[PDB]
Amino acid sequence: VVPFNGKGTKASIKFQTMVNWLCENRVFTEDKWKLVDFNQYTLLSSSHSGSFQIQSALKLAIYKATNLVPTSTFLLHCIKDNKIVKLLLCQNYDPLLVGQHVLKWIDKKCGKKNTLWFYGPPSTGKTNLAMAIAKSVPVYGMVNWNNENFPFNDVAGKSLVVWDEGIIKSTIVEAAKAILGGQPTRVDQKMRGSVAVPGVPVVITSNGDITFVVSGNTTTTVHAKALKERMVKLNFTVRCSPDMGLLTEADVQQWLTWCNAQSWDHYENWAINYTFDFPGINADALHPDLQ
Amino acid sequence: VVPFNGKGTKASIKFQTMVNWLCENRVFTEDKWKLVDFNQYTLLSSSHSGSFQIQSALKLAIYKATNLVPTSTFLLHACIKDNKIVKLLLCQNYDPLLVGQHVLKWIDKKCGKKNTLWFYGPPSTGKTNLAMAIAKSVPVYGMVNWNNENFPFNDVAGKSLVVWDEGIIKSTIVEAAKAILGGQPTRVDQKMRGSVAVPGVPVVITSNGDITFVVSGNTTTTVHAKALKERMVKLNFTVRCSPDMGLLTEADVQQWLTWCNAQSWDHYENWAINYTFDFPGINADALHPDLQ
Amino acid sequence: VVPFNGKGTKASIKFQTMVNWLCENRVFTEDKWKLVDFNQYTLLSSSHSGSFQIQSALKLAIYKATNLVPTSTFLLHCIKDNKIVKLLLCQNYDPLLVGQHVLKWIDKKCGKKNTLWFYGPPSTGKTNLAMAIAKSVPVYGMVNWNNENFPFNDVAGKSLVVWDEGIIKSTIVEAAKAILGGQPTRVDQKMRPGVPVVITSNGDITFVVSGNTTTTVHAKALKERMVKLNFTVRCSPDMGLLTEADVQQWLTWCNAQSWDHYENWAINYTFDFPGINADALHPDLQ
Amino acid sequence: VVPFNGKGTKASIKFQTMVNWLCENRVFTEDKWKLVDFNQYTLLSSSHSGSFQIQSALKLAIYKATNLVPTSTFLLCIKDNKIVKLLLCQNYDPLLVGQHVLKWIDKKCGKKNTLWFYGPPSTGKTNLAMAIAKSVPVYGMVNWNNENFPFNDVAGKSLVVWDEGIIKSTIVEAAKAILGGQPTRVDQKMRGSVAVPGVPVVITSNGDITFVVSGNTTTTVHAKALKERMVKLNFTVRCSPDMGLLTEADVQQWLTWCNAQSWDHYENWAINYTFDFPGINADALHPDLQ
Ligand SMILES: Nc1ncnc2c1ncn2[C@@H]1O[C@H](COP(=O)(O)OP(=O)(O)NP(=O)(O)O)[C@@H](O)[C@H]1O
Ligand SMILES: Nc1ncnc2c1ncn2[C@@H]1O[C@H](COP(=O)(O)OP(=O)(O)NP(=O)(O)O)[C@@H](O)[C@H]1O
Ligand SMILES: Nc1ncnc2c1ncn2[C@@H]1O[C@H](COP(=O)(O)OP(=O)(O)NP(=O)(O)O)[C@@H](O)[C@H]1O
Ligand SMILES: Nc1ncnc2c1ncn2[C@@H]1O[C@H](COP(=O)(O)OP(=O)(O)NP(=O)(O)O)[C@@H](O)[C@H]1O
Ligand SMILES: [Mg+2]
Ligand SMILES: [Mg+2]
Ligand SMILES: [Mg+2]
């Protein structure tokens, strides 16, 4: 599979440099391009043949950031002052295992446990944490934005699907089962080449148990066992301070930078047998920096 | 036929070379091209002219791979005891020599009316694994489960293989089923392509139960049972398999078919004179010492 | 009329030569072009100006081969050795007369009798002979490929229309009276010649289904437009496909024979085709 | 099974007598009742109860005539009969055919429930079929029903007549069951059993009905299936310009004579019902017709 020779001219080389510059500065939308580099956009729009190049370059940049680059590389660049590390300790979970699992999860390497689920009372910061992760990936999507009868459209081309205040109904149980489990949709099967893999990670925030499928005017539990195998459940029980504020990329990347530097032995021991719930803080193995 | 005495420019020769290169590297989709070679794709998509060239090259490469070059040449290659497929066939009591030799004719549409292979048996006996192994070797194939429920046979043309997994035939589409399973092209095929006859696509079917019985409402009917038997060939996978045989690979398929091509064809010509709905099993003495 | 004074460039003359090449080699479809000369097709498909010429040349070649050139010349290139000659002798039909009629029938010189009809028991070789002619003419079209309720789409541009094992429904009988009679469709008249039609069937086609009952209202009108041939004797399985050459040698030989015999019967075109006259059998056919 | 111990009043006995009278004179339609006896109809129509009694009597008479009595009862020197002359011209045994007609109308032929007449036009195909249809109490015609629903209101008839018929691929499935004598699903859901009504069918056509019309072409998939359920007759000989409309009297005389003769020659053919009806055997032809 040696690459074709194809010696290109300067016009194509400049376009390729622009495509690389798009990925390097995370410019994936027309609005972001206008907000960042207005002069180049104005110059490119002086002609139809120059306007076609914008639409040509954006698609290639998005595809490169989605499939040709590991997503975790966009995340990885004191520790005891990081808000997420402080926040996760307030919920009585080990920050190191959570951070280590997320990096393994975002690269679709957890196996069939593709979907994370955040559950707890309101005003515990579940939604705030989910937004920070979604803000850091190249492109993210929502189930809230999609149409009510077709909430699982526009899945392809996204690195993370966020479902806020979610709930599952019986009319969409067959679609949710495939997407939450990482199984590719038939669109990818009939567009790409047979059972592929891309799929997409999913993060869910909820104020109630989502394993209860809503059918008619009755709550049912036919699929409770089937759903649980696909998620890792976190209980956000402790209310957070009202003035914590929103989380940003610098907070998440700093937190994720520390986690990657530690040994994988602690995570890989539990990773052998995946459990529906996530283990809590173990004082016999807490990292010395967090003691 | 004397070819038209035209001569192309530098760009035309480059485009023809690119079409050949696409054929040689088994690239037939946009995603495959982006995965294999991103640089050439970017260079081609840098301008409006190249965006049309990409589509033309892909459309020509698919046609060249499917209609101009025999499919079996993509299977053969350019420790026979240890081949996984040979062991799997022996576990299910079938001769690896006859199975491989029949494929080299069925995949080439040379078997006449019997255009389909049928896999039957209990679950977890290895029906799906072998079926997908053949598919991964041919250039492009289509599986029925992708299509719409009411329209099962879309995009059948232009494919080297049709895959139907654990499917069941309904009476509402039994009329179209006898067409593809029989190897005769659909009505639209002749019209768009002028000739009353254009060969069909080979089909492979896996099933846990007898599909010769057609679903008709909430009732099973056997009126079409006779018609399916001369269009099909049956194999029985009656032995379960331990979880010690992972997914099969194209390397196993190529090695298996390579050996079957080199051996003599007398053992196949005897059966090929009058095809039988049942595929004969292992013969104790006919097994060659290379597999004894 | 004096042609225009326009002088073309190198590219235009090359395109005109390409059209002549396509017309000469009977390359009227994209699939045939790919199967015959893949190199030229790949060269042309490199850009827009090359791809447009493919469609333009195909359309011009079809028009030239259908309207500006007599179709019979496309068919003309041991007479007893030909398979078709024996086949017509078995059915008690004179090979010379039927051969001459086909040339006039394909050339629209038989007046209103624009339709041929093969009648007989099943498996008597009717479709084998009929399909042989369809592969000899430049372009042919079958009724069976068309939509069930629109059987007569894309009739213009075909050198021959074939209707195999067909039956006439009273809901569409009025359209059949036109095409089988050779009258041009009203759409052809608005935008701007008939197309020969051949019908093979097992029963009597003059009966028209009307509901769940047969009726004979249209039996009289359909008789004038058609010629009936009887294929009664079953064919041996070893005959196989009839080659386009077998038609070519048969038609070419019948062309050179004396034509005055056919003109005598041509004075009053009967619905029934006359059988073999033993006093008129050609010596070479014996 | 013992009849109920109840007793009917004087008025109910009159209605019971009226029901028997309707069956006795083959009065199954309102027009027939008006034509035959106007005084009684006018007297009955004087009020609500009399009008309702008309409907009740008609329904009960139809049921009694079609379900509780064998049809052959309504059908019950011979050289002068015109029907005998007709079959002799068509080269068929007058005695053998009549016995089959008696068994067929009584649903005693098993699967082969349908007759078929074939031949060139103007040879007596339709005339004979209508004469038999007139003799039985009630008959139905396929041509009267709607095109998309050719088999509506099949039950309740002693015979169903199909003239110049042709089978469309859309309705080929419904044709298989009814022509084969299989009961309709509608009656099974209503009556409760799995096989009850039973309807003989007679078909006359000028073309081969084994072929099924599908789209704009002919198919032979269903050819063998229909052959099992049908019997074929060839009317290949011409017929005089007059051959006056055959009457019920002509039919009744012919079948009565056939039933009187010995039945032994029939059941030999009934061992295995052949698709094609055997022709005249000049050796076995009855001496009266020799
Ligand atoms: N403007 C803000 N943006 C983000 N987080 C904020 C903001 N103001 C306060 N917060 C913090 O976020 C907490 C609640 O934010 P939110 O993300 O809605 O939490 P939650 O528990 O997921 N909410 P709920 O949707 O009610 O279940 C507050 O208690 C603060 O600690
Ligand atoms: N990717 C894989 N993961 C796990 N097991 C595999 C994989 N590929 C092959 N196998 C095993 O290889 C064997 C092939 O079985 P398979 O062909 O799937 O059987 P089957 O009867 O057609 N299956 P089913 O789809 O349940 O009807 C089984 O033992 C599988 O467990
Ligand atoms: N595909 C074929 N290959 C070889 N021989 C063929 C083929 N099709 C037909 N024949 C031969 O051609 C002769 C008659 O062919 P066929 O087209 O079936 O005739 P026909 O009278 O038009 N049939 P039918 O369609 O039943 O009316 C016989 O000798 C056949 O053996
Ligand atoms: N009104 C009539 N009643 C009785 N017989 C008639 C009548 N008119 C003509 N006939 C003659 O009766 C014979 C049969 O009549 P008919 O029932 O029309 O024949 P058929 O063979 O069933 N006709 P077709 O339906 O065209 O196949 C023929 O000799 C007719 O000439
Ligand atoms: Mg929330
Ligand atoms: Mg045919
Ligand atoms: Mg009649």
Residue numbers in the entry:
A (entry chain D): 202 to 278, 286 to 499
B (entry chain E): 202 to 279, 286 to 499
C (entry chain F): 202 to 278, 286 to 400, 406 to 499
D (entry chain G): 202 to 277, 286 to 499
What does the literature reporting this entry say, word for word?
The main replication protein NS1 plays a critical role in cell cycle arrest, transactivation of viral and host genes, and replication and package of B19V genome. Based on its similarity to other parvoviral replication proteins, such as Rep72 of the adeno-associated virus (AAV), NS1 is predicted to contain one nuclease domain (Nuc, aa 1–176), one oligomerization domain (OD, aa 201–270), one SF3 helicase domain (SF3 HD, aa 271–501), and one zinc-binding domain (ZnD, aa 571–671). The SF3 HD domain of NS1 belongs to the SF3 helicase superfamily, which unwinds DNA with 3′→5′ polarity. Totally, four cryo-electron microscopy (cryo-EM) structures were determined, which revealed the detailed mechanisms for ATP binding and hydrolysis and DNA binding and unwinding by NS1.
To reveal how NS1 recognizes DNA duplex, we performed further cryo-EM study using fork DNA-2 and solved one NS1_2-570/dsDNA/AMPPNP ternary complex at an overall resolution of 3.43 Å. Like the NS1_2-570/AMPPNP structure, NS1 forms dodecamer in the dsDNA-bound structure. As supported by the low RMSD value (0.8 Å), dsDNA binding does not cause significant change to the conformation and overall assembly of NS1 in the dsDNA-bound structure. The density maps suggested that dsDNA could be bound by both NS1 hexamers, hexamer-1 and hexamer-2. However, due to the density associated with hexamer-2 is relatively weak, only the DNA bound by hexamer-1 is modeled in the final structure. The DNA adopts regular B-form-like conformation; it is inclined toward one side of the ring formed by the OD domains. The side chains of Thr210 of NS1 protomers A, E, and F point toward the DNA, forming H-bond interactions with the backbone phosphate groups of +6, +2, and +4 nucleotides, respectively. Instead of interacting with the phosphate group, the side chain of Lys211 points toward the major groove of the DNA. In the dsDNA-bound NS1 structure, the side chain of the His249 wraps around the DNA backbone from the major or minor groove sides. The 3′-end nucleotide of the DNA is inserted into the central ring formed by the OD domains, further confirmed the 3′→5′ unwinding polarity of NS1.
